[PDB]
Nucleic acid binder design. Sequence first.
RNA 1: AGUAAA
Lengths: 115, 376, 1169
Amino acid sequence: MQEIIASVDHIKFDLEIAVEQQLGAQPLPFPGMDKSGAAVCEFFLKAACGKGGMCPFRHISGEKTVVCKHWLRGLCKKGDQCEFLHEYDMTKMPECYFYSKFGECSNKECPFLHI
Amino acid sequence: TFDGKRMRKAVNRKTIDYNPSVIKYLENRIWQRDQRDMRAIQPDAGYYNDLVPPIGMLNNPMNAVTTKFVRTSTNKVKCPVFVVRWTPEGRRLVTGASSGEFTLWNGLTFNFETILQAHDSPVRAMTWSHNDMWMLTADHGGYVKYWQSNMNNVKMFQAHKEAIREASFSPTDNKFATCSDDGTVRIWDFLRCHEERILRGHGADVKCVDWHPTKGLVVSGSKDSQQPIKFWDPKTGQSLATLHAHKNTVMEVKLNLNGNWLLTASRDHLCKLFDIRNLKEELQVFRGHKKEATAVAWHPVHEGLFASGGSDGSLLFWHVGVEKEVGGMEMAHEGMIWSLAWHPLGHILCSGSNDHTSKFWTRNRPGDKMRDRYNL
Amino acid sequence: MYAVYKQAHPPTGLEFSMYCNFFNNSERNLVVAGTSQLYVYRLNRREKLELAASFSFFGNVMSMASVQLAGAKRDALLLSFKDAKLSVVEYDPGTHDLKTLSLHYFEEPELRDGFVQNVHTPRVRVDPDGRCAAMLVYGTRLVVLPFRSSFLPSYIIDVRALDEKLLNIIDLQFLHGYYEPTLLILFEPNQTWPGRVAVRQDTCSIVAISLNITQKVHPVIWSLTSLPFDCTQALAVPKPIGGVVVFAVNSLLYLNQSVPPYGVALNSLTTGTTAFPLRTQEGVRITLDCAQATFISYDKMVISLKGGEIYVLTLITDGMRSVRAFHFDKAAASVLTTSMVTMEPGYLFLGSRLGNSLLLKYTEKLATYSFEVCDSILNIGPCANAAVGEPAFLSEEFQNSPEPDLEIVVCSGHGKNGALSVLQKSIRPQVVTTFELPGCYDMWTVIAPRRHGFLILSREDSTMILQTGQEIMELDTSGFATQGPTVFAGNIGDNRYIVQVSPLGIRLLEGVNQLHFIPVAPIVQCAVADPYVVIMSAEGHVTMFLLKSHRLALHKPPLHHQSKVITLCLYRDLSGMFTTPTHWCLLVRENGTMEIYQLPDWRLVFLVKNFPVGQRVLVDSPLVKEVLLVALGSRQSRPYLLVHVDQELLIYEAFPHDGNLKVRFKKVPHNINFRRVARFRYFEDIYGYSGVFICGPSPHWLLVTGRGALRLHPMAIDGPVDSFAPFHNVNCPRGFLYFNRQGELRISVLPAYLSYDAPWPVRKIPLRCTAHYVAYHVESKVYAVATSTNTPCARIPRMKEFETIERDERYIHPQQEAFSIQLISPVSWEAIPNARIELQEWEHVTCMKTVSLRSEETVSGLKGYVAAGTCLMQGEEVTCRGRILIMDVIEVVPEPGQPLTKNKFKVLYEKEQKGPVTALCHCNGHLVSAIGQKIFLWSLRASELTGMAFIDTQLYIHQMISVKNFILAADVMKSISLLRYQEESKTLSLVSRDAKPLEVYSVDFMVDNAQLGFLVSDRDRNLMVYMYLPEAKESFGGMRLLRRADFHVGAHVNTFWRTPCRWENKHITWFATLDGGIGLLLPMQEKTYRRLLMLQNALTTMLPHHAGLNPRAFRMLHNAVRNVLDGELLNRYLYLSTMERSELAKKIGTTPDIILDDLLETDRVTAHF
RNA sequence: AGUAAA
Ligand SMILES: [Zn+2]
Ligand SMILES: [Zn+2]
Ligand SMILES: [Zn+2]
């Protein structure tokens, strides 16, 4: 009902213009920063980021098929250089070590794949 | 060897979950103007769901006198714990030990999460910035490291040639101050890791330092009785005042978030309160520590309430304007309590001790006959 | 960036009540105060509370007391505000307003002892003998205000520096029967809390200090040190018995100086919690936690418990005048009370914030009393949640209106007084017949031998007469003149005759037959009373006709011709304040002079020299267009004056003031904009209501009832109204007639489901349970309401094992909440049978919203379900988890005889989550949920939610709202985080956040042409607007949200909603407060904001505001970016006369026309609901 | 994968 009476689909917001153009973005100091919780770099995917390595926004690669288990716990040091997926997809979850090794698994709410 | 690969049976773990209390407070908030409209919690075990967090009991700070023991968290190597700090959202609690290691514990069930080899010398200082983005730590070798939430080290530099005892950020993240055993306080630019001012004049090793919440004022302790407490101007690097508060080594200096009160702890078995607007007299002297007072911590919610730690392992609670302690635990630890850290909500207090353990304390439950070893 | 605050609905809910001599010493009045509102009530003998006065303050009343000063003609009120402010006010005769006697400020930093957060409200107490008043400030400073230049210089007592150190003051009361003012103070020197009562058992004390005003010495007398730890309040016993009664949570104590303490235990929860000697009070099992008590007799006390139970307490006393026993009598149950006062004996008033405050009458029955309800005051309670929906019924003539037709449904009250309030700002008539009658511009309805027999309509050249019986048909027979226009038609002689005025003469009829015609400078206006008829010509000539027993006899009035009469009216006073039935003629002349004459004679009794200016008070001795003097209220006891002056409406209220007329008129504030056909249309009975209808571009209903409060309800639908008339017919029972601008005559009745005796037309729907959330389902057009009921708690969950609570018969069980979700039909405002979801035993609904989720079985993508988040509350030591409930409202074949049963609940998703579900939201067809310290974005499949993205967040997210793939999340202790979702990469990221901590109540958006603000409500009753400004230096790269607007709304806000303006892309952000009010934030352009800011500064500086409060300081935040205007202060410019407006405009270098254009456009664009 | 089972 809120969008029926007060719709904003016809309004282009300065917030939208700023996020799309990465206005105000500045290079990250301390090179090894995680970039976790940051938007992916639209420029890098489309044509070219420009900054490179120091961009506050993620530069992703299409070679990850397994979800990063450290990223789920919130402690991932590799950042963009991580070889595991940083997407919340519980179908590409890592296989359960305990189910694959010691028969059954302990917790009944195990996110890892029991195959 | 612990690598997370051996089979372990599922076991229910003790928790202190604040979500029911937050929900109850949110419900009461709608129809209750203040705590005067708040219904009375009965001292009966059946009133478990009537509990609210400290933000719901601003008129009675006695709720946050954490005398109920929850759990003791111990590393597998039995190393003394020097500093304990909660993450800014309270998700985890990080400890700093004499082995240079960081140990992470869950903020709800207080179980081991992960361990890091953070320093090559004992970890002495650990502080988060006001924007919750950076954790700054220092070790006994004089090195200062920058950390993120994911516990990844991004910058390292040597701030002092001797052991650094404490560090504290400015009101913004732009500057921080460190104290060391060389008798100096140094002002640093966070981004550039550049030494701006060197504050000399203490005459002995500086044991503590604190930055004012608003004004831009730095207060430090010391070992020598001639200059036990000094006030500094970070911009000019010149001493503003000398406070002869204690006759022994000053272990803690903690400025209250109101910007008026200075809390001090010393080896003369005393804690003192000062009004920084009038330093000619003491506001209050807190007596009741049988041994040296080695750690203090203001409550995040109640501005008059703070906890104190002692070298004998005692943990006392005080309020501003009250002569005697509002609570305490003789023999809470077995050894000097090095650091105290309140959970950001204020319902849990964590203590790190010279004994190789870290303990969690929460509010006493209504209807509890407090006959346990820490109470009676 | 820039906004103006407007108040749409005044706060409802009373916190303080007293019975004092507000007006004079002859009678006492009920004086009640809410937060910024003060009300004075008289009692009418059924018994009805009549509003006598009402005042607004730029501040929140924290304590209210009254005292009789020396040589005073009435009582003086003592009001406490803010942190330490004591205001002494009194009723001012002459004017009809408040007079501030003295202002006292005690906000020095040295009184706060270094504390910056004040948790103590200033509490004012008065000595029973009126010797002094005392206000406790910051919990440690006792301000003493001595009385005899009626006030002696005040002094401050430091309670920490007394004979005993007084810490943690619980309550303080002045005692009875002492030579000096003796203040009893209940305090807690060593504080404890119920979680720890095994090592600090009972530390509560009372002391009495004798206040020597002259010597300023306050020795302590009658100490007592070991009171129970849970003492809550004290009440001074009246003089014959004396002493004090102390309320504890589980015990009751009577304490006297010369007698040993006497106390009893109200339940078994005292066994291990206090060592104070307590006897078991047989027959009662209660607690006194938040209870209101007052003395109805010297030994009888009536107590209103939590839960609403009413008890009468008797102090059993022997011959030695010493209390020896207690007696409890379980009387009726009533409303949850915040206040309690005894009126005239036999009458008791219960003030309430949670439910309607009601007046009770108690009668002794054949030692024991019985209570009955006599009156109630409508209270939209704490507005927890609100929903905008479509009204069920609208006339087909209004379906083509470009503006939406909306209503507000609010969760109000609490517990047994929980309800739903259906709120509509304007009035929508129910049209039952429309007649297309071009040409006729004016009309009248007359009563024929109280139905209406004829409808007289006047054209430019002819008069059309309609006979209104079983069917309305034109009457072409003789009788009424039809060859020309009609000036006025009406009844005379007690509805026995019909009078008709033509431009050529005056005609009398007795139905369809003309009785006689008197020829009569054409007639332009006629005023008719019983039995007086006064007509005015175009040149001001006035003649009078008397109905002589019938016939009309000419009586030439002896009026002077110094100035020509421009307009006049006739008034018949029934409830007589026009003293020195009576008949009067209010007259306006060309020179701006307004005169009143007694009608039998024509002697002057009242004169005003500058009437058109619009003076705020009219005392005895341009282009006025119409005046109407009419009496309203109960038995027509409230005369009002309505004036039309150059596109301005003046409303005046008459009040007595002492051979001239002993009355004066007070200007009444309003927002009605006027930007010969009579515009003021009085009606005696329209759906039982009496009042005046105002025609013009902005039609309004002016209603006054037995309550005595003025109600101004707009009728903006159907556009401007040209003419109006009451109409009582068989097809139109107690209805009305009005012509729109398109020449259509509509036969309408007022819709019967709303009450028009409230600030807004409202319908309260009693649920008898707490209403938490309300959501409107656009499909099927029904409301989903999450409710809760309290049941005794029987088990203690462990971690699951359950422990049965085994206690004794005097034990009191804790309350356990059981939640349910109900469907409410807007057609009949009833719960739909067999449509009710019952939550699990300990499950609490933490959020409930209507969410638009993607689906394929729709023309668009979205579907519009109802989503609820729950958490299983089972204590601190059990892990808290919850569920997400996704429900659809479907259409099914109704059961025979139950048309409501066409709608049923369809549960699509119902599963337990991996943590507590604390907030819900939707984002571009996805479901956003706050589960624990993470926020998840879900996609709804056929029957399952699939995780798309997540992000770590703060301690506890309780509020989330989204706009265009952006999400605003609010934390309990941290302020706000701005989130963004990228669909292509399935990335949920943090854009910005507020670094500083803040306790947020709710969040919304502020919408401009391109600027998007983030509106945040505060625990300190503040409103803040944050903006994302990545190019600003203050925002360190955009990672920090910067606040750009500040405003202190003296109320807590928990719900927001947005509407567009009636301003291209600006939206109005509405909110409902927890004090029962409704406010607005309207975005403004910078130039208009600057002009109105100069106006606001001038109004703050140059006006005598009530209680001496400062409007600018009240609206200051809690540094402060004050970019929000105060429209309630800007309304004061509308209330000023034209001369004062011109003076202020010249002072600030602008034009009154420009100021009015700026001010009236804000009222125009905000006319919703 | 860096301690997922401390
Ligand atoms: Zn980039
Ligand atoms: Zn990773
Ligand atoms: Zn598994």
